[PDB]
Amino acid sequence: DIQMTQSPSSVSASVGDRVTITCRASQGIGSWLAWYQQKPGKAPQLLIYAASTLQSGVPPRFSGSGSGTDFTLTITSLQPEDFASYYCQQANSVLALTFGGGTKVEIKRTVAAPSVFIFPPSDEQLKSGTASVVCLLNNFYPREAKVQWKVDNALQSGNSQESVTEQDSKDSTYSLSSTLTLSKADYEKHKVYACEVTHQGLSSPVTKSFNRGEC
Amino acid sequence: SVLTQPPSVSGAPGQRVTISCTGSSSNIGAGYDVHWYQQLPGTAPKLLIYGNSNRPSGVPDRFSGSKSGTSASLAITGLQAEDEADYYCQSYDSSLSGSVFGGGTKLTVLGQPKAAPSVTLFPPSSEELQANKATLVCLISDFYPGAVTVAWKADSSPVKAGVETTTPSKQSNNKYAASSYLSLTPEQWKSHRSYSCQVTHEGSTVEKTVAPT
Amino acid sequence: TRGVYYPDKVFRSSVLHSTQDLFLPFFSNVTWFHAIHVTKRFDNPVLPFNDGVYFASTEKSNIIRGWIFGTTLDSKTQSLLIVNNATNVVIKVCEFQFCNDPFLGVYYHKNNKSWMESEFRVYSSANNCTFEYVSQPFLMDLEGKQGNFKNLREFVFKNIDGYFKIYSKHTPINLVRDLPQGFSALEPLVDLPIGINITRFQTLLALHRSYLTPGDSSSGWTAGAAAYYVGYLQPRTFLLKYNENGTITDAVDCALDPLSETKCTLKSFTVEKGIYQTSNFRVQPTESIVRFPNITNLCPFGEVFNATRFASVYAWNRKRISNCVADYSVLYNSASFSTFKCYGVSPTKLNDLCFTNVYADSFVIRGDEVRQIAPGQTGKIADYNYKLPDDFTGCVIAWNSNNLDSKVGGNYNYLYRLFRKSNLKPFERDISTEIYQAGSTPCNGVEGFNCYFPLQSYGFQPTNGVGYQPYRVVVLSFELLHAPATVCGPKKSTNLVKNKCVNFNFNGLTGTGVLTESNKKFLPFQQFGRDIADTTDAVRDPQTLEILDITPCSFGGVSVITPGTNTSNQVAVLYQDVNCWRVYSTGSNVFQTRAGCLIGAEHVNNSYECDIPIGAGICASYQT
Amino acid sequence: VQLVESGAEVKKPGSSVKVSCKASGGTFSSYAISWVRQAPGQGLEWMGGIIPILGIANYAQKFQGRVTITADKSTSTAYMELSSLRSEDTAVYYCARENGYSGYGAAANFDLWGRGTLVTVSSASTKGPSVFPLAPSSKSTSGGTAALGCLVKDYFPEPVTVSWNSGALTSGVHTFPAVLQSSGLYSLSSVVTVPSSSLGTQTYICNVNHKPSNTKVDKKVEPKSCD
Amino acid sequence: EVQLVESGGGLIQPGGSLRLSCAASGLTVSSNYMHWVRQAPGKGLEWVSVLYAGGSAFYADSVKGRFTISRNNSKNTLYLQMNSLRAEDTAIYYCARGLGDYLDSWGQGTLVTVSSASTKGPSVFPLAPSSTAALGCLVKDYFPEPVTVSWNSGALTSGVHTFPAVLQSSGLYSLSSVVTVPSSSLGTQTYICNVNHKPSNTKVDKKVEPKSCD
Ligand SMILES: *[C@@H]1O[C@H](CO)[C@@H](O)[C@H](O)[C@H]1NC(C)=O
C-alpha cells in the first residue's frame, strides 16, 4: 500500500556542503519517519527518530523537518566518517515496516578519462570450451560510463555483466569491468571484437579494436 | 457530587454503621469501581479503600467495603473518637469524561453535658462614640452549639438589622463559645433607654438588660 | 380440490413452496342456495364474513349482478358496493341506505323480443363517497336459456390490512345441479384499497318480468333457474405445485386427512410405503399475537454518538443503556457510518430480539485499527488495548471524523498502550502509568535506557491519509442473561387470547402454542423455564404478571401406514403413546397392540410374513 | 514521598492566580498528577489532571478553557493557573497523585494528596485595624472574678494570633473566630478570666501582629471609673 | 550497553529448511518488539517479520507462509524457522529490537545462500597485457563466496583493484583482478597471482606473461 521513494540516489558533495537528501511517501504520515546510516560491511544504525528528534550518541549534525509528505536529512557539516547509505522507514498501525530506497554520498573527484584496456582470451582457455573476453575501465568519474560492446560493427545486448569495485580510501578512484561469456563455436564465427565508452571527460568516444589473428 | 450520599448519619461507639453510595448507571452502575476517601476537619483527605476489596498501608482492618449492582457500601467495625470525618465515594464517569466524587456524609459521634446558657452583655466604651460607629457584643459562654438563636430588642420593637450568628470555637474543656455583634450608630445610641440580648436554648430563656445612662 | 389461488406474485418454476394464509378447506360443508321458478326460492340472506368467502356460481342467464360489503348497511358505517348492470361495471364506496331486499329488474316485451334492464333498487341514497370506479361500457345478452348451466364463475375475497383482493376465473361446465369438481387456479384481477371493516355481506340477484307474471311489483315477477354456493376461508397450511407455465395444476392438503399430511411433510405428490410422524391432533393457527414490555422511553443514543469529546483508546468510556426502547433504523439510515460488520446479530433481526442490557464503549482510532477491533485480530490494539471474546454478541460502529479531533498542528490529545508483558483479558480496560522495563535491571521510575512510557501519543495531522485518519468508534456489546430484559426493540403490543392454538411472540421469540393458566410459582430473576426435552413451556408475561404454560397443539408421535398411493387411498393410522378422545377420528376396527393402538386396519388371527413393520412383533399387509 | 504546596492566596474578582505543588523526597516519576478542589459546605470537584512524562492535560466539562494546568517534569512541580476568578471560587485546592491498576474497574484512585491552598476572593483592599479596650463594670463583677479583653475590627484577614502579655498568659485565654457581615468585614473577640485582687497592681495589654500589613499596635486597658 | 549475536546462516538447497538463533544481551526477547529486517545484496532493506511482547507475530506478504517465529525464554534466544525457501531469499538477515515504529538496537548479519550447485574449484585464466599497462588473472566458474586474491605473495599492494563477485546465469560466481604495472618492467619482474578458498581447498599458482606470437 505504501511505496517509499527517495528522489536522490547518488549525490556528490564536499565537506562544506549539504546533501539535502529527501524521501517521499504515497500517503501522508505525520512525523513518524526514521533515518539510518548503514556503512558498507557494517550493521545499520539509527540516526533520527520521529523526524524531529535525535538518537543519543548520534553527532549533532543530522537534522530533519517534515510534516506530512516532504521529509529531509540535511547535514550542516559533512564529515569523512559518515559516508554511507540512508533509508527512510515508516511503520503501519501493525508493526509492518516499509524501508525506502538507498542514497549514497560520494566524495568529488576529477573526471579524468575511462582508460580502455582490451584483453583477448588466452590459449589455455581454448581447451576449456568457453571463451571470455573483457575490456577494463579505470580512473573514471562519475559512474556514467557506457560499456556497450561492438562485435563486427553490430550491437550486442544481454551478453555482458558489469562489475564495479568500491571506492578506495586513498584517492576515491572508481574501476569498472564487464565479462562477456560465449561458446567456443561462436568465438571462431566473429572476427572483430571491441567495446566503446562515452564520458564527459572525453571529447570523442575511444574504442580499441583487435583481431583474432594477431602476434 | 452527583453520586448520592446521605447528608448526615449517626453512630455509637460499638455498633456497625453502613453508608450507601448509589449513583447513575453511566458511572456507578457501569463497570467502574469505587474509591473511599476520609477527610478530617482540618486535614487533607487520604485514600481509604481502593479496588473495593484491597486496603492500602496504614488503613486499619476495621474499614471494609463492597460493591453490588449500582451501590457501594462502607462497613466500619466500631466507631472511635478520630472517626469523625466526611466520607466520599469517587468513580469514573463516562458522560462527564472525568472522575467525580460523591455528595459526602457527616459522621458525628460526640456528647457533652449541655447546661443553661450563661450570657454577659457589653456596650461600647466612651471612646467608641467618637468613631462614628456603635457595636454591641453579646458574649455567651458555657452552652451548646445547638439552639444558638440570638435576638435583639430595645424594649419597644425587635431589631432586624445588623444581627448575625457566629460559629462557636472549641475550648480546652470540651466547651463551645461564640459571640454576636450588632452594628449601630452613636446618634441613635442615646435615643433608646436600654438594650438587651435574647438567647433561646432548649426552652431556657435568660435576659440581661444594661443601662447606658 | 378447488379455491386455490396465487398467494404471492413471485414467479416460481419447478419448486414446491408451503405458505400460510386464508385458504378454503378441502371437502368442506359449503352452504347450498337454490333458486328455481318451477318454488319461488329467491334467497338473498345476510351471512357473516368471518375471514373470506369463496363464491361458486353456476350461471346461464347472468342473474347475479353484484355484491354488497359492509358492517351495518344502514348508512351508519362505510360500505363497499360492487355491481354489474347492463352497461358498465361500477364500483363505489359510500355510506348507502340499503333496502331490506335489494334486487335488479329486467323486463321482457311480448311485441318485440328484447331484454332490457328497467329497475335498479339497491340503495336509497349516498352522502359521502371516498372511492369510485367506472369501467368501460359494454352490451350484455341478458337472454334466458332453456338449457342447463353453462358458465361457472369462482370468486375469492380477502380483507387483509384494508386491501380487498378479488380472484376470478371462468371455466365452462355442463351439469344440472351439482358442484363441478376440478382444479382451476384463480388469477388476480384487481386490488381495491377500501380500508374498511367488513363483517356481513349479501348476495344480489336479478328479477325477470313479462306478461306471464301478473300482479303488482312485489308479486308479479319470476326467478328463473339459478344456483350458487358459499365457502368460508380458514387459515390452513397448503402445498402448491408450480410448473414451467406458472399456473397451478394441482395441490395437496395438510389439515384434511392424516394421509394428506404425509404429502405436506414429504413435499411430494406421491406417498411411498413407510412410516410417517404426521401429527396427533393438529389445529391450524388462526391468529398471531405479540407481547412486549410497556416501556416507551427513547434510549439515549444521541449522547453516545454525538458526544462533545471522546475518551482515549486505553481509557475508553463505558456506558450502560437500559430502561428504554432502542430503534436501530435511524442510526443505520444516517448515511454517515463506515463500519457495520456484525457477528451473531442481523440488521433485520435487531428489531425483533433483545437482551438483558446494552453496553456502549466510545473511543477514537484509525481505520487500520478500526478493522482491528474485530475479535479475530492481534496487534498493538487487538491484544493490548481492547479484547473481544470469540463469542461476542453485537458489533461496533465507526464513522469518519476528519472535521473534529484535529488542530492546525499535531493533535496529541489521545494516547494508546504500546508495551505490555501479558495478553489482555476480554472486556478488560487497563490504565497503568508504571514505567515499562525490558532489561534485567529493575527500573525505579526513571526514563533511562530500556525504560520507556507504555503510553504513546497519536499524531492526528490533517495531512494524513484516509486509513490514518482518526475515526470515532462506538462499540455496542449485547449481553443476554437469564434476568428479565429491561430494554427491547420497538414493536407493537396486541391482546391476549386463551385456549386457542395461536402464534405467540414473547420477548423476541415466536412460535406456535396454546396459552393456559398455570399454578407454578417462579423465582423473580428467572423468566423462562424448560422441560426435560429442552422445549420452552413457560412465559412470564410482565405486562399482566401472569404465568402462562405453552401447550403444544399436537405432540406428534403417530404412525401412519400406507400400502401405496398407486394401489389405494385407504391408510392405516397407529398411535404410539395412546392406549385403547385424542384421535383424528374414531373410525372402526380399533385394535390395541403393545406398540400402540391401530385404527383403520382389520386384525386377523393368522400369522403371515412381515410386510411392513408396525412394532412389538405386529405386522400388517394389504390383502383381500 | 510527600507533596508540598504554596500558602494562602488572596486575589481580586477578575484577577489571575498561579499556585504550585512541589514534590519533596522524590519526583512525580511517571504517575499522573491531578488537581482536586473542595468547597466549604459542598463536595469535591475535579478540574483536571496532568501526565508529567508527556505534558498532556485532560480537563473537565464543568471547567471551560479558562484554567490551564502545567507540570514541569525536571523540577517535579505542577501548576494550576486559572483566570477570570469569581467570588464563588473560595475553595481550597489539592494536588492528587493517581495510582492505576489492572482490573475490570480501571477507576483512578488518588493515593497521595497535597496539603491545601486556600484561595479566597475579596474586593476590599487592605486597611488599618483599630482596637479599643473593654473593661467590666461594677454590676458585672458580682463575684471575685472579672471579664475583660480586646477586640479586633476592620481587619481584612480573619487569622490573627492574639497573645496576652507577649505569651505570658496561658490559662483562661480563649480565641474566637470571625463572621461574615453585610459589607464583608470581619471581627473577632477575646475574653479572659482574672481575679479582682490583681486589677489594682497588674495591668493587661494586648499585642496584635499583622504580618501582611507590617503593623503592631500596643494598647493599654484600664478599668472604668464611673462604675 | 546492548548487543545481539546471530548464528545459523550458511548454504542450504532450494526448498529446504534452516533454523536461525538470535541471541540477545542486555534485554529480554519476551518483553519488547523484535524485528527481522532482511537486506538483499546490492539492494535496500526489507521487512520480513515482527514479534511482539505477547504471543502474536506478523509476517510480510512475500513471507506470509513457510515462516514461523518461536522465542525461547529458557536461554533468552530468538529463533526463526523457515520450512521452505526460494531463490530470491538469499540475503543478509538481521534481528533487531524496535521501540515501536523505529528500531534502536541492531546487530550482526548471517549469510543465507540458496543454490542448486555445489563446491567447485576456481578456473584461473591469465590476461595478456597489450603491447603503463594492465595485467591480471581472471577467476571463472567458482563457488561459493568468498575467494581471496594476492599478488606476489602479498608483496605487490599498489594498484590492486579486486572487483566484487557477480552471479552469472549458470549460478557460479566470477571475479576479475587487475594490477597497474609499467611497461619498462614487463620483461624484468614476474607477477604471479594466488587464488584460493577454504570451501574447495584449491591452491594454484599461475604466472601471467605478455602476449606472444600465434
Ligand atoms: C448526531 O447529530 C447529527 C446532526 O445533528 C444527527 O444527524 C444524528 O442523527 C445524531 N446522532 C444520533 C444518534 O441521533
Residue numbers in the entry:
A (entry chain L): 1 to 215
B (entry chain E): 2 to 214
C (entry chain C): 33 to 70, 76 to 617, 633 to 676
D (entry chain D): 2 to 228
E (entry chain H): 1 to 131, 138 to 220
Sentences from the paper on this structure:
SARS-CoV-2 Omicron variants feature highly mutated spike proteins with extraordinary abilities in evading antibodies isolated earlier in the pandemic. Investigation of memory B cells from patients primarily with breakthrough infections with the Delta variant enables isolation of a number of neutralizing antibodies cross-reactive to heterologous variants of concern (VOCs) including Omicron variants (BA.1-BA.4). YB9-258 and YB13-292 demonstrate best cross-neutralization abilities towards VOCs, including the Omicron BA.1 variant. RBD substitutions in Kappa (L452R, E484Q) and Lambda (L452Q, F490S) variants abolish YB13-292 binding.
Probably similar to other 3 RBD “up” spike structures previously characterized, this structure is highly labile and we observed many antibody bound S1 particles likely derived from disintegrated spikes. In this epitope, residue 417 is centrally located while residues 484, 452 and 490 are outside of the epitope. HCDRs and LCDRs of YB9-258 bury 694.9 A2 and 533.5 A2 of RBD surface areas respectively. Residues in CDRs mediate extensive contacts with the epitope, among these many are extra or altered hydrophobic residues introduced by somatic hypermutations. These include F27L in HCDR1, S53A and Y58F in HCDR2, S30G in LCDR1, and F94V, P95L in LCDR3. Absence or hinderance of K417 interactions to Y33 and Y52 was also observed for mAbs 22234, CS2335. These antibodies are known to neutralize Beta variant with K417N/E484K/N501Y changes in RBD. Although K417N only mildly affects YB9-258 binding but its effect is the strongest among common RBD single substitutions we tested.
